Symmetry: D2
Amino acid sequence: RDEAGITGTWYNQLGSTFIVTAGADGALTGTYESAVGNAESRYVLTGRYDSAPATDGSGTALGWTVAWKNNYRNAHSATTWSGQYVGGAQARINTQWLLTYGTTEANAWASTLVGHDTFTKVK
Amino acid sequence: RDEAGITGTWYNQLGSTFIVTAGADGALTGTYESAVGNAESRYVLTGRYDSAPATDGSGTALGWTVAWKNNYRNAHSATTWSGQYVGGAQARINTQWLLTYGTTEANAWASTLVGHDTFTKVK
Amino acid sequence: RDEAGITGTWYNQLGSTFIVTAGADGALTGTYESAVGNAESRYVLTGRYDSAPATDGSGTALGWTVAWKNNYRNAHSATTWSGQYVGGAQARINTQWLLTYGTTEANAWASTLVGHDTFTKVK
Amino acid sequence: RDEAGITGTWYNQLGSTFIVTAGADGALTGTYESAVGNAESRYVLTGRYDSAPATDGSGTALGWTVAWKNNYRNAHSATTWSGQYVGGAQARINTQWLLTYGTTEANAWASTLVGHDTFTKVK
Ligand SMILES: O=C(CCCC[C@@H]1SC[C@@H]2NC(=O)N[C@@H]21)NCCN(Cc1ccccn1)Cc1ccccn1
Ligand SMILES: O=C(CCCC[C@@H]1SC[C@@H]2NC(=O)N[C@@H]21)NCCN(Cc1ccccn1)Cc1ccccn1
Ligand SMILES: O=C(CCCC[C@@H]1SC[C@@H]2NC(=O)N[C@@H]21)NCCN(Cc1ccccn1)Cc1ccccn1
Ligand SMILES: O=C(CCCC[C@@H]1SC[C@@H]2NC(=O)N[C@@H]21)NCCN(Cc1ccccn1)Cc1ccccn1
Ligand SMILES: [Cu+2]
Ligand SMILES: [Cu+2]
Ligand SMILES: [Cu+2]
Ligand SMILES: [Cu+2]
């Protein structure tokens, strides 16, 4: 499967570092370090991936979450990345993400940012 | 914290069932059953939540992922929900979500659906 | 078509007011007044809709944009709503939206909010 | 303002062509031709932009809509792009977009795709 291809250290276009282990069962576990935002050092992440993807040249669907609290900082927010892994010489994880931060109900309409990150195996 | 308030069974507006356990460390673990889509029975989920949220009336940021493969069905896709938990008599988890399915690179522009789910403690 | 059904005044769940005219050619023109945010009084809007939708019970795709500058206020931002009109006794426009605000390149990863608005013919 | 900088022909990463005129009043009008999807030849577009942006190095917020019906084809859908214009030697329009297609109410949870397009002045 893509277990071997996904497991390892990845980098996105902002300079962030995504260290992950793909389990045989479809589990993703690791750490995330963001180069931007209210973030410092490494944060726990967990997620899931398709462990038996199609064999027609389609990518491998996956997703993971980081809550932005660690021993150093708390940003009262969480980001989820949703995307697909694309193997080969230029292996990539192409994602879109949603960052929700805690708000009062009056401000909840403004609680969620959306963006896109592309992860590669080389900085 | 919100550990007690989050842990348990939740229902969204489509009839789906979200069974989760909030850990003291910020972990979310459980199962998801979707009332719609290429889905059948329960699927593994994992995620994260802010375990020390603000005490100013703001909600509690969280997120989780489901890869849509179980023993019965594989839909070559994954959904991430990003949102906040709002406690009280009418407790709610308000989310937006991203569903990515595996595609060829030529079709990757069309690989991601976006939506919103509101979860409540009563069906 | 849905020209008659779309044209008119609509209200969303925040209390905002969406006044629109659907043209025979697929044009949407009107004004938007937001009950929340850095907004005051009415703002110009323009958009487009499917003027020959399917007749199988599917909704009518449409979209529109507001730039958040008028004679009174400038919020250096723009929102686009994308959704479908659903006719009948409980007529609805169900949307998701993207709000982008002007940022420096260093902050561009955080420039876009995402949400969802449901518009009805009654307040 | 950015009227001169925005007006003209733009190209995104898929090969699509975005021809627009920025009006003094904040209007965007033009045509869109998509290199991908259920699309053929040019489609009408309309939108809005911030005509008095900040002068602190922030980008210029804007948005526009295309309904995917012309004389040749009807795809019962509409896309809205929301983003900012960034001037200079490497001028760019960075966007995220929402594509909604008409659906029955039972399938409405799956009606909206999300993505991101970067437009440049050179192919
Ligand atoms: O910045 C963060 C956490 C880090 C996000 C990095 C993102 S994840 C997507 C993208 N990909 C990356 O690799 N990095 C970035 N959360 C914002 C929470 N705050 C709102 C907010 C929104 C925009 C800008 C700054 N803040 C609210 C708040 C609560 C308490 C204190 C301060 N602020
Ligand atoms: O349907 C699913 C999995 C279940 C999603 C339920 C969602 S999660 C968000 C929302 N909230 C809920 O509680 N339920 C719904 N994935 C679609 C994957 N397929 C694309 C697709 C897109 C739209 C409609 C149907 N299919 C691709 C494909 C690969 C192989 C076979 C068949 N299809
Ligand atoms: O608030 C607005 C314009 C009004 C948005 C109302 C939305 S549209 C979606 C939803 N539906 C509705 O009917 N109403 C709401 N733009 C924020 C721009 N600012 C960022 C921002 C982000 C979050 C909260 C406040 N500001 C940046 C900025 C530039 C200069 C000065 C001040 N601020
Ligand atoms: O393809 C389109 C219109 C063209 C979209 C091009 C996008 S806009 C964002 C991105 N940026 C670009 O420059 N190009 C692309 N609409 C899909 C509507 N159909 C769903 C759909 C979803 C995914 C793939 C194909 N179809 C439904 C349907 C109704 C009737 C017949 C056939 N299909
Ligand atoms: Cu912040
Ligand atoms: Cu499917
Ligand atoms: Cu603001
Ligand atoms: Cu189609």
